[PDB]
Every structure is written in structure tokens, then in C-alpha cells.
């Protein structure tokens, strides 16, 4: 099914009220003016966006003769069988006028007869063209026939057939307001707890389509029924005094024929949040990275860097309305640079984790291909996924190998990759909701057109920690793997740690722990915990890795 | 079949309890609330990981109408034959609801319609889409239909087909615990399985079945003993290889061995001991020394003791002349090492592979370095991949390559000066069976790989003329 | 045009060359002007080339096709040149149409011996489509690039891309018009905007830097709101960009075109 079963599409239902309902339920008006109002409507959009449910919701709402046709069902075995099935559909609609034909997945049979060269396929296309002309000429001026078609690939339709649809309706991915309405319609015949806030559910499903939101409701329902399954397994365990999951299957198998009743429950808002995490949206099946486990508790010091990233990326993602009032575009470009081992990837994996947005990580020249146009197509496809799943974070690690500066000797295979990113970051097409982070050791090797506002306008420098900064880092590293706190300050402030980066401090802790094992073995052949004497052992055998910090401080 | 026949998938067996068992067996609760719980599950992973058996085991454990369908079984010759075979499968399940459809090898028929321009193939995809929607719409409330599918390459599926599977399960490569469980699941109806589990890295469930069959077959050539499995394991190879070079094969090199016994060998045999003290292993170790000192041999010894696979790269062998192919070869080494965990990646002559990213280094030589920088970030720690460098020019490598967390620690493999030569020659001769005093003066005459070639070259003169001491002086004047 | 501040010289050239003949082709036909224009916008990045080419596409009220650099390239032998030929077929069938090539130096590189053979066929395909045997009347072509010298010299001739319009860094007086345009399209008054835009700290700022300067001013406003909100809520507001917030942005934002003469040539 009914009109209630389709939600989140109000513009579409507004247009279809005068393009499907009026031709069918307003036959008297058309006959008075002597006008044949036979219409053809083509629904298209991403898969799972409720194209098939919309057609059947309208079909039951209007209450006229409905002819639902699936495209593969037409095809027959003999020569004229396939075309006669199409001819029977349109002739039946004319005989049953007013009528509504729904050609589901019409692109299966209405493909381009140019490329799809055969004998039956061309005659199938020509039969639909002939069929769609009879309906608007054989109907008796009082009853109209409306043809509804749905397809995921409108570009695969033959232009002779696509042009016969007067109306094309695009049903894109739902917005936050639409996703809330879809959830309410899906969670309408179910029993819910009053704690459930659909605004929270809508905002935590960025790139979800109507089918994905159905899986969240489907997963939440099974979540509420888990209490009646664990309790049922406990009943089975009361008769039988191989792992844990295998016992559950065998115990339920041993009963099987036993009939039990499940008490009715109410889905809790806590269960809904668990369901969202379980459900992977169809837009994130391919091309997306996993959210890093790094948090701000893993990053020591870097308060200046943390504040910039919070204001530029984490802020607008979590409070888009607050940043919109002051007039800040929901898109940021940040370039992290500095000597190696100072925490660029670490501080970029913490922003991706603490912002709760989607994450795509690019590993240097990962998108490059040897074929012409395939290297650029990957970049263009990269920003398509990041836009449909907005908000999304694109992390270009070691980006200097992907966007070298376009000199007079940069060839053209790599210069075309730069120009693709120039248009994707700041061109004609919108990229709002995409936040870009770049990490590199050689920012001077990046093209200047990349490093301008609107693409990567903000540059943050992550350099060698100071004497007081190494104290925070060493404590952060040590507390994540467990000496006291007073000795850590002494070790970190020692002049033998001058020039140590954040990686060297991690190497110092590793070297100090290795000395503990050597100490333990000596104290065993004649509860391992790092002692102060172990630290002094590593303070002599560990040297800084960045031997020439001036090579990276000037860029 | 039974549940016991499939093991090592405890996570999978518990997820499918609420996704396959509940919609089918527990359909009485769905009717009470009026909720069509028609579910679709996709199982993907490496070949021979029990995907086919898992569907059949769950089929008998529920007790519903099971329809086993393979994708090639529905493809026809005429036009409407192929689509009607698929259409009949879904129509039967609706009439047999509750039912469990299993579409094995679904990627054969459900491939992308973008690349597939064939008319029938496009209509096959559209027939599966229509079929799965009928199940979601044309079934009674108390009777639900669950569609199972298996594919080796889930990315080959059409996105419209793939979105209709709410649950995807990645039955990946078994781990040491999983392989131990797999062995205990096949040999239960016939021994320290921990040693067997750790000695077979990279093996899959089907590979472990051949080992069980090999041990059973070898036990009938004469109850199965433990030593039979050790012989049977080497007979069946997975469908790289653990080196057979022990430290007995290596002469001298005690200081070098001690460092590796704590850097690489240490946190493999006893991962918990090094975990308690916070010893997180880095990406790996850079072995620097003059050529011919057995740097490749040392790495093979480390993998043998650690019982981890060994992969060797000769350096400039990866340097392709195309744009993204030199970097793709590097990115493919770490993809195979991930599936072969634990594994050791050995880069011989790495100086010419990742030089310093100077201000004048073109661009192709800098993309390879940036490929290794982003690949060494997923090496070590909690992955099982270890990278060993090998170069006689340690100062020609980029600084970022040798930072901590990457190949930072440097170990010098010393040249045999006086007594290492004696130890090497005795070790070499122990594998080709004179006494030992004769073997000393040969090695005491005034590198390390020269002695190995000298011994076999000196053995050529013996064949031309049993090995005698007098046959070594003639070979000392023709081996350099 | 309300989004484009300054650039009066560029706006006048684009109205006489594209918007003029599209709206009233009868007037331009009498004087003898063909219904086809080729424009090459070039200059330092961030100075408004793509912005001014989106106003022309919108003010002319004609059909619009936008090309994102080397978007037409394909791995197969003939499929990249076929896309170019098909591009001008759709434009010709729906004339008047505006074809915009953003970052065009990646699609028409200068033909040399070192140039790839596959990328030299695309250049020669565009040479025939822009000015060959067939007519492209009703097709107006706009190109935007930072490196006009990397474009093939045959493409940059009358009949293919006749006129080159330089879109350079704004002057001190122009930065006032741009900053007011950016501010009023996103919501301080106008007297303070003149002081902010004329400040010596804004020397060398482009249109993208003024927009970045305004963004850094809004972030300074939010920091001020954050600190003051806690003080007046725990112990005891309206986010508006004040003149004190502009002071923080001026000390934070630096120009992006560090070598203006690299593009001015």
C-alpha cells in the first residue's frame, strides 16, 4: 503493498499523482477535452531504492487493472513465441483499459539493439516499440493505459524505447529525513520501546538505501529474539549432563520436532544500535577500508594537531548544522607532513576512528594502472563511492607518489592522474561530505594546484617531539602495553633521547623490554617487568632514526 | 553430513543460528508479530574452505525442505530454458516453504551484467532478482524461505544480486587453532595435534583432508602413529614452502643468530612471553653484509625454526617497465604472505629496489619506495608477516624504510676470516656422505659461498678420477 | 554572476563571445559572426576559471556538457577517439550547447615525438571535430587550464580555441569585491570587509584564499563561541563572525600561489 509501505519519496509520489493516477482515475476529464492521455513512466535509480515496491504500492492504491510483467518471463523458445508474449501484454492492456502495465527490469529485454546484435533481441525491441504505440492509439479516448518501467541501468535501454517514456523519475539514495521515514514505515507493524529515537538511527546510517534499512530492522528483530533462544538452549542443556556453537546446533537438532512458543518482546533502542553495526550497506561492500582501532588515547601530545583536525574534520561531521550557520562547506582537505615516525598515519587513523564516518585509505600509488584511462577511472570511481557514502574520509598515505608536481618533464601518464584529482577535489561536480587527508614526507613534491584551498588548503606540520613532548608520548606508549611514572619522565628527558621521534620512543620501549628478557634469563639459569635498570640499557643502544631533521623541517 | 563434520567455523556456526535456523525453524514467532523473515546468506572465501559442506550440514540439522542447486545445472541451450530453470527453483521453494535454497557456485550465473553483454546472461541476473523478490513477497507469515549461496569471488557478483544477500560470511584461511580443530574433526573416528597444526601454515580444510587420507593410506602400507603424520604432511603440499635449512646447515654466525632469536624467532615460538613484556615485533630486520656470506641461508634457517613459509625476492626482478606494474608486484607479495601466515618475506639486493627518495630520483623509483612504506605498515605486530632485507649497501636505502616499525634494526653478517671457514666446510661435507683435520687445511688455505661451490667443484674431480684429501689441492687452483 | 566578484573584463569577453550569440543569434549573424566560439581560460589556480565557466553555462541558458580532464580516455584502441566524436555529435544535435573542458592540458597535450601515440590520436580527433570538414555551428567550447603552453599549438588557433582569456590574481581593489561576494553569498557589515581585504597580510591572495580566509574566520568564531558558552553556562550564544575573528584569520591564512609568475607566462 500500500501507499504506507513506500516512504521517503514525497516528490516522486507528488509527480505520480498527476502522471499515473490522473490518466487512469481521470478518464472522464480526458474524454471531455478529447485528449488521449496515455503516459509512459520510467523509474530508475540505485538498486534497493524501492522501485518495485513503489510500483506495486501505486498499483493497489489506484484500483485499476494491473498487469505486472517481468522481462525474462517474456522470452520463449520458438521464433515468434517471445514477441507474441509482448504483443499479448499490450493487447491485454488495451482490452482492459484503463490499465497499468509494470515492466520490471525492462533493460533485460530492451537493451541496445546496436550492440546486442541478434535476431530475436532486435525483434523484441521492435515489438515493444510497436506495443507502446498501440496503447496510445487503440484505446477508446476515455480509458488510458499507463506503462511503468523500472531499471537499474537506464543507459542500457535502447534510445528508441527510452524516448517513449515521457517521464523519467530518479530515485536516489535517501537523505536523513527520508531514512527516518523509511524506518518508521518498516517499524510500523512491529512492537518497539519508547526509548527508540529514529533521528539517531537516521544519522548513524550515512550510505544506506531502503533495502539496507530493511536489514537493520531485520537484524534488530532477531536481536530481540536472542533472549528466547539462549533460554531455549539452557532448556536443552538440562537433559544432557565439539565447541560451543556446535553444541547449540546439535541440541536444537535433537529436539527439532518439539514445539515451543516464543513470548512476545519489544525491540529496544540498544538492540537497534547493535543491528546497524551488523548490517553492511550495499554501498560499502567494495572499496571501503575498515575503521582503524587507533583512538586519541593512542596519540600522545600533538594537541595543536588534534585541535586543527577536530575543528576541520571531526567537528563538521558530528555537527553539520552548527558549522553550516557560520558558513563552512562540509568538505575539508588536510595535508599532514613532517619527518618520518612523528605520528602522521597515527593521527590520521585516530580522526578516521573518532569521527564515526566512512573511511577509505589509499596506499600511495595504489590506483595507478598500466592501461590508458584505467588509472584515472579508479580515481573517478574513488570519489563516486566516497560521495554516495557521505560523510566519508579519504586518506592518501604517502601521497607524494600519487600527485607529483606537473613540471615540463613529468610525462603524461602521471600528469593525467593529477588533473583527474584536480577536478575531483575542486571542479564542476559537487564533492560535499568528502573530507580528504594527505600524509607525506615530501610536501614540496606535490603539485601546487593540489595544495590550494578547496582541495588541500590546510597543511598541518607533525615534527619531532620536544623534551616535554617525549614525556607524554613515552607514557602513552607504555600505558598501552601494561618503572612507575616518575622514571618515565627521567628516561624521556634524558639528553640521550635528543632528536627521538615517536617511532624511536616505541623502539626505545621495545629495546628496554628486550633487555628485561635478557635480565630474566640470567636471573633464571642461576613475572617479567621492565625496571629502571632495563631502561638505561636501551638508552645507549638506541639512536635516533631521523638523522637529518632539517631535510623535512623545510618544506 | 553432520555438524561435527565442519569445524573451525565457530563464528560462522553461531551467526547462522540467528540467520538460517531461526527464520526456518522459529517461524512461529514471526507469524505472531506478522513479519516476513525471508533471509539471504552469502558464503565467500578461498577455495576448499568447507563452503559446500557447511550448507549441507546445516541442511540436515534444521529439518526443512532443502533444495541443492548448482549454477551450471540451470544453464540451458535454448532461449527461455535457462531462465525457466531458475524460475522453477524459486517457485518450488515458495510451495515448499519453509525451505532452504542453496545456490552453489552462484558467481557462474550471477556475474556482472556490465561486462556480460550476452542477452541470456543479462536475463539470468534479472531472473534471480525477480525470484528473490517473490520469496520476500509471496510467502505465508509462518513459513519463511532462506537462500544460501557460495562464491569464491564475491566481487564477481552483480551488485544488484549481491545487495539481496543481507549477510556475507568470509570463511577465510584457517588459523593454527582452526587447523587444530579441523584435524580433530577428521581423525576423531579413527596424537599431539598442536605440532601438526603449527607445522602446516597456509593449509586449507581440503588440504588437511589429504594429509589425513595420506596418513591413513600410509598406515595401511604395512592405528596411526604421530610420526606417520609428519611424513604425510610433507607428501601433500597446499594448493610458499617452509625451508628445510636448519641452523646445523649454517656454520658459525652465533652473534647473528642470537639477535634473530629475540627479534624474529623469539616472538613466534612464544608469542605470549613477548606480549606480556610489550615486545611488539617491528616489520622486520635489515641484514647487511658482503655477498656470499649466507644471508639468504640465514633467513631460511629463521623460517625453518619458526615453522613459517619463506618467500624470496631477488630485487630488480620486480622492476617492470609499465606504470603500475612494478608497484603491483610488491603489493602482491604482501597479499600472498597474508594468506600464508606465518610467512617470511626476503628481499635480496634491496638497495636497488628502494633507494633514497632524493630530490632527483625520477618518479618510477619513488613509487616503489612509497609502495613498500605503505606495505610495511601491515607487517608484523599481529599479522605473522616478517620482512628480512638483504643488501651490501645499507646506506643506499631510504631513511623511512629503516625507521622503527619498519626494517630498522640492522644486523651485520660477518665474512668468514679464520675459523668460520673451517666450520662452514665441515658442515658442507657432513651432507655429502677423510676425517676432519683434512677438511681444516682446505679451509685454512690462504668468502662463505665460495666454500660451498668449492666442495662440489672438488667433487667433480673425484668423479672424473669417494673423495680424498689429495683431490682438493687440484681443485684449489680452479675455483675462485 | 552574483557568485562571481570582480572579473569584469573576463565577464565582458565571455558575454560577447558566448552569451551574446546564444541569446540573440540574429544580431550577431548580420555582422558576420559564426555561431561557434572557442575560449581558453588560463591563469594561476584558484582565481576563478571554473567558477566563471559555470556562470556562463548558467547565464547563457543553453545545454551544458562538462569534461573532467582526461575523462574520455579508454583502454581500447578506438574507444577514446570515439568518445570525442560522440561528444560533438550530442552537442551538435542539441545546439546551442556549451562544452567545458576543465583542466584541458591533460586531454590535448602538445604533439611531440616523446608523446604517446594513443594520446596523439585524441588530439588529432579534437582537431577535426573543432575545425575540420564537418560543421560545429551552435557548439561553444570553453577550456580551463593552468598550463596553456602544454596545449597543442594547433588547438590554440582561431576556429578551434580562438581567444585566450587570462584569469590572474586579483588586485587590492578586486579582493574587496571578491570578499564581499563570498561573504554575502554565505550569510561585520561592508566597511570591515574592505579593511580585511585591503590588509597587507592579504597580499597575493587569490579567490580561493579569500574563501579560505573567510573559513578561518568562521572557525575562530566557533572557538570563541565554544569557550564563552562553557563560561556562561557552568559559572552562569549567537555564532556571528566578528571583526576580532577576522584578525585571527589574517594571521593564520597564507597565500597559495607562491610563484605567481610561473603561471603568468
Amino acid at each position: 503493498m500500500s501507499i504506507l509501505d513506500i516512504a521517503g519519496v514525497d516528490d516522486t509520489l507528488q509527480r505520480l499523482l498527476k502522471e499515473v493516477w490522473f490518466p487512469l482515475r481521470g478518464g472522464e476529464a480526458c474524454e471531455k477535452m478529447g485528449y488521449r492521455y496515455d503516459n509512459g513512466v520510467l523509474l530508475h535509480g540505485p538498486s534497493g531504492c524501492g522501485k518495485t515496491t513503489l510500483a506495486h504500492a501505486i498499483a493497489g492504491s489506484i484500483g485499476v487493472a494491473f498487469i505486472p510483467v517481468s522481462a525474462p518471463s517474456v522470452i520463449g523458445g520458438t521464433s515468434g513465441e517471445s514477441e507474441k508474449n509482448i504483443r499479448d501484454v499490450f493487447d491485454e492492456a488495451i482490452r482492459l483499459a484503463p490499465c497499468l502495465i509494470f515492466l520490471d527490469q525492462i533493460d533485460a529485454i530492451a537493451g541496445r539493439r546496436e550492440s546486442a546484435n541478434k535476431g530475436m533481441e532486435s525483434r523484441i525491441v521492435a515489438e515493444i516499440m510497436n506495443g507502446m504505440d498501440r496503447i496510445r492509439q487503440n484505446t477508446p479516448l476515455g480509458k488510458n493505459v499507463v506503462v511503468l518501467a523500472a531499471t537499474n541501468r537506464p543507459e542500457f535501454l535502447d534510445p528508441a524505447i527510452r524516448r517513449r517514456f515521457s517521464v523519467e523519475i530518479d530515485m536516489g539514495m535517501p537523505s536523513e529525513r527520508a531514512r527516518e521515514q523509511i524506518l518508521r514505515s518498516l517499524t510500523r507493524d512491529l512492537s518497539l520501546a519508547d526509548d527508540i529515537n529514529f533521528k539517531e538511527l537516521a544519522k548513524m546510517t550515512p550510505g544506506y538505501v531502503g533495502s539496507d534499512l530493511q536489514y537493520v530492522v531485520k537484524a534488530a528483530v532477531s536481536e530481540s529474539f536472542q533472549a528466547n533462544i539462549d533460554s531455549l538452549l539452557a532448556q536443552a542443556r538440562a537433559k544432557h549432563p565439539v565447541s560451543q556453537p556446535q553444541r547449540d546446533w546439535l541440541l536444537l537438532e535433537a529436539h527439532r520436532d518439539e514445539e515451543v512458543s516464543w513470548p512476545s518482546t519489544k525491540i529496544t533502542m540498544e538492540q537497534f544500535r547493535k543491528a546497524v553495526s551488523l548490517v553492511q550497506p550495499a554501498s560499502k561492500r567494495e572499496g571501503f577500508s575498515t575503521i582503524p582501532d587507533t583512538t586519541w588515547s593512542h596519540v600522545g601530545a600533538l594537541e595543536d594537531v588534534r585541535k586543527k583536525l577536530e575543528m576541520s574534520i571531526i567537528g563538521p561531521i558530528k555537527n553539520p548544522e552548527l558549522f553550516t550557520r557560520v558558513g563552512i562547506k562540509p568538505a575539508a582537505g588536510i595535508l599532514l607532513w613532517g619527518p618520518p615516525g612523528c605520528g602522521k598515519t597515527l593521527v590520521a587513523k585516530a580522526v578516521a576512528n573518532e569521527s564515526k564516518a566512512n573511511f577509505i585509505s589509499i596506499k600511495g600509488p595504489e590506483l595507478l594502472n598500466k592501461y590508458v584511462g584505467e588509472s584515472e577511472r579508479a580515481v573517478r570511481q574513488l570519489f563516486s563511492r566516497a560521495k554516495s557514502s557521505a560523510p566519508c574520509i579519504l586518506f592518501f598515505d604517502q601521497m607524494d607518489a600519487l600527485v607529483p608536481r606537473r613540471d615540463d618533464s613529468l610525462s603524461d601518464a602521471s600528469a593525467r592522474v593529477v588533473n583527474t584529482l584536480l577536478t575531483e577535489l575542486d571542479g564542476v561536480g559537487d564533492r560535499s561530505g568528502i573530507y580528504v587527508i594527505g600524509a607525506t614526507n615530501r610536501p614540496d613534491m606535490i603539485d601546487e594546484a593540489i595544495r590550494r584551498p578547496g582541495r588541500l588548503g590546510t597543511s598541518i606540520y607533525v615534527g619531532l617531539p620536544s623534551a616535554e613532548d617525549r614525556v607524554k608520548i613515552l607514557k602513552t606508549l607504555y600505558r598501552n602495553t601494561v618503572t612507575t611514572d616518575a622514571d618515565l619522565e627521567k628516561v624521556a628527558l634524558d639528553l640521550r633521547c635528543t632528536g627521538f621521534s615517536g617511532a624511536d620512543l616505541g623502539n626505545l620501549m621495545q629495546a628496554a623490554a628486550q633487555a628485561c628478557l635478557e635480565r630474566v634469563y640470567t636471573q633464571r639459569q642461576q613475572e617479567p617487568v621492565i625496571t629502571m635498570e632495563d631502561w638505561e640499557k636501551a638508552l645507549n643502544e638506541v639512536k635516533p632514526s631521523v638523522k637529518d631533521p632539517e631535510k623535512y623541517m623545510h618544506s | 553430513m553432520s555438524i561435527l563434520d565442519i569445524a573451525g567455523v565457530d563464528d560462522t556456526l553461531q551467526r547462522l543460528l540467528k540467520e538460517v535456523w531461526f527464520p526456518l525453524r522459529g517461524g512461529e514467532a514471526c507469524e505472531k508479530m506478522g513479519y516476513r523473515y525471508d533471509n539471504g546468506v552469502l558464503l565467500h572465501g578461498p577455495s576448499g574452505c568447507g563452503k559446500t559442506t557447511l550448507a549441507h550440514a546445516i541442511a540436515g540439522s534444521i529439518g526443512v525442505a532443502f533444495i541443492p542447486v548448482s549454477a551450471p545445472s540451470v544453464i540451458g541451450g535454448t532461449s527461455g530454458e535457462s531462465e525457466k530453470n531458475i524460475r522453477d527453483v524459486f517457485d518450488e521453494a515458495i510451495r515448499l516453504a519453509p525451505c532452504l535454497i542453496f545456490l552453489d557456485q552462484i558467481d557462474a550465473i550471477a556475474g556482472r551484467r556490465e561486462s556480460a553483454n550476452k542477452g541470456m546472461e543479462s536475463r539470468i541476473v534479472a531472473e534471480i532478482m525477480n525470484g528473490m523478490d517473490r520469496i520476500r513477497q509471496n510467502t505465508p507469515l509462518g513459513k519463511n524461505v532462506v537462500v544460501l549461496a557460495a562464491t569464491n569471488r564475491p566481487e564477481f557478483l552483480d551488485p544488484a544480486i549481491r545487495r539481496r544477500f543481507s549477510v556475507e560470511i568470509d570463511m577465510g584461511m584457517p588459523s593454527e587453532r582452526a587447523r587444530e580443530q579441523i584435524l580433530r574433526s577428521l581423525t576423531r573416528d579413527l596424537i599431539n595435534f598442536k605440532e601438526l597444526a603449527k607445522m602446516t601454515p597456509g593449509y586449507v580444510g581440503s588440504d588437511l583432508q589429504y594429509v589425513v587420507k595420506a596418513a591413513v593410506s600410509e598406515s595401511f602400507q604395512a592405528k596411526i602413529t604421530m610420526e606417520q603424520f609428519r611424513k604425510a604432511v610433507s607428501l601433500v603440499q597446499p594448493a610458499s614452502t617452509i625451508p628445510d635449512t636448519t641452523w646445523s646447515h649454517v656454520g658459525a654466525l652465533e652473534d647473528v643468530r642470537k639477535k634473530l632469536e629475540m627479534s624474529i624467532i623469539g616472538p613466534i615460538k612464544n608469542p605470549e612471553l613477548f606480549t606480556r613484556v610489550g615486545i611488539k615485533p617491528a616489520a622486520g630486520i635489515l641484514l647487511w653484509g658482503p655477498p656470499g656470506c649466507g644471508k639468504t641461508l640465514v633467513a631460511k634457517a629463521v623460517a625453518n625454526e619458526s615453522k613459517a613459509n619463506f618467500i624470496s625476492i631477488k630485487g630488480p626482478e620486480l622492476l617492470n617497465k609499465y606504470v603500475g606494474e612494478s608497484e603491483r608486484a610488491v603489493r602482491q607479495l604482501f597479499s600472498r604472505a597474508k594468506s600464508s601466515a606465518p610467512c617470511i618475506l626476503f628481499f635480496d639486493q634491496m638497495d636497488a629496489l628502494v633507494p633514497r627518495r632524493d630530490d632527483s630520483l625520477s618518479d618510477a623509483s619513488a613509487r616503489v619506495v612509497n609502495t613498500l612504506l605503505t606495505e610495511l605498515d601491515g607487517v608484523g605486530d599481529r599479522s605473522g608477516i616478517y620482512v628480512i632485507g638483504a643488501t651490501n649497501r645499507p646506506d643506499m636505502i631510504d631513511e623511512a624504510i629503516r625507521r622503527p616499525g619498519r626494517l630498522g634494526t640492522s644486523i651485520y653478517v660477518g665474512l668468514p676470516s679464520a675459523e668460520d671457514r673451517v666450520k662452514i666446510l665441515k658442515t658442507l661435507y657432513r651432507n655429502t656422505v677423510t676425517t676432519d683435520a683434512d677438511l681444516e687445511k682446505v679451509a685454512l688455505d690462504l668468502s662463505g659461498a665460495d666454500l660451498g661451490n668449492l666442495m662440489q667443484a672438488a667433487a667433480q674431480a673425484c668423479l672424473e678420477r669417494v673423495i680424498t684429501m689429495e683431490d682438493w689441492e687440484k681443485a684449489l687452483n680452479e675455483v675462485k | 554572476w552574483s557568485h562571481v566578484g570582480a572579473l569584469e573584463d573576463v565577464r565582458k569577453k565571455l558575454e560577447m563571445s558566448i552569451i551574446g550569440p546564444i541569446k540573440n543569434p540574429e544580431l550577431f549573424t548580420r555582422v558576420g559572426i559564426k555561431p561557434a566560439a572557442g575560449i581558453l581560460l588560463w591563469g594561476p589556480p584558484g582565481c576563478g576559471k571554473t567558477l566563471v565557466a559555470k556562470a556562463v553555462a548558467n547565464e547563457s541558458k543553453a545545454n551544458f556538457i562538462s569534461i573532467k580532464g582526461p575523462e574520455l580516455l579508454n583502454k581500447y584502441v578506438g574507444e577514446s577517439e570515439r568518445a570525442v566524436r560522440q561528444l560533438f555529435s550530442r552537442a551538435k544535435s542539441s545546439a546551442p550547447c556549451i562544452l567545458f573542458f576543465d583542466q584541458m592540458d591533460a586531454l590535448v597535450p602538445r604533439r611531440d615525438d616523446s608523446l604517446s601515440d594513443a594520446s596523439a590520436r585524441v588530439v588529432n580527433t579534437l582537431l577535426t571535430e573543432l575545425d575540420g570538414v564537418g560543421d560545429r555551428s551552435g557548439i561553444y567550447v570553453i577550456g580551463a587550464t593552468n598550463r596553456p603552453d602544454m596545449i597543442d599549438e594547433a588547438i590554440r588557433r582561431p576556429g578551434r580555441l580562438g581567444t585566450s582569456i587570462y584569469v590572474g590574481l586579483p588586485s587590492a581593489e578586486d579582493r574587496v569585491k571578491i570578499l564581499k561576494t563570498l561573504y554575502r553569498n554565505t550569510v561585520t557589515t561592508d566597511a570591515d570587509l574592505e579593511k580585511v581585504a585591503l590588509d597587507l597580510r592579504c597580499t597575493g591572495f587569490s579567490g580561493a584564499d579569500l574563501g579560505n580566509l573567510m573559513q578561518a574566520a568562521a572557525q575562530a568564531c566557533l572557538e570563541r563561541v565554544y569557550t564563552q558558552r562553557q563560561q556562561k553556562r557552568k559559572e552562569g550564544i549567537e555564532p556571528v563572525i566578528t571583526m576580532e575573528d577576522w584578525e585571527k584569520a589574517l594571521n593564520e591564512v597564507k597565500p597559495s600561489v607562491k610563484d605567481p609568475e610561473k603561471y603568468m607566462h
Partner: peptide, 24 residues
Amino acid sequence: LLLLLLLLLLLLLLLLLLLLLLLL
């Protein structure tokens, strides 16, 4: 018996040409 005209499939499998890229 009646002889019928039936629609069938084909193998085809055309081979396509490709363009590559080289380094400096």
C-alpha cells in the same frame, strides 16, 4: 511431425585490442 524454428545461443568470444603505458 512438425519441424520448428528454434532460437539458440552462440560462443562468439571476440578479441579486443588494448593500449598500454610506459615509464621514462
